[PDB]
Amino acid sequence: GSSGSSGLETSSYLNVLVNSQWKSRWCSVRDNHLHFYQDRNRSKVAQQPLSLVGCEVVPDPSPDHLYSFRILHKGEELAKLEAKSSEEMGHWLGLLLSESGSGPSSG
Structure with a gap:
């Protein structure tokens, strides 16, 4: 939407569906893996x-x-x-x- 904001670090807030309920969750992708967090500064891992x-x-x-x-x-x-x-x-x-697909497989 707003094209002109630096500082994303592919660590934006996303809605992670939970028990048929859209709950706010912090999604962080790294090393070809999507980690889940709750608090700020990746304090604790959601799961x-x-x-x-x-x-x-x-x-x-x-x-x-x-x-x-x-x-x-x-x-x-x-x-x-x-x-x-x-x-x-x-x-x-x-x-x-x-991320989902990289290396000697499909490349």
Whole structure:
């Protein structure tokens, strides 16, 4: 949306679907893995990280927000995140995809 703000560090706030409920969660991707946090400054880890490496990020929007995506592992479900704006989801889609699949496999 707002094109003119530096200081993202691919560490923006995303909506991590939980028990059929969109709850605010801090998503941090690093080393081809999506870690989950709660407090600020990656104080504590919300739960086991994600092994994006291999997964598949597909744009699965909703009738209430066309800015939501989900990951899949060979057709299965791994997680589901939701951005705030279309431009935001567009940065995550490719961001994750790149991580999910790199090396001597498919390259």
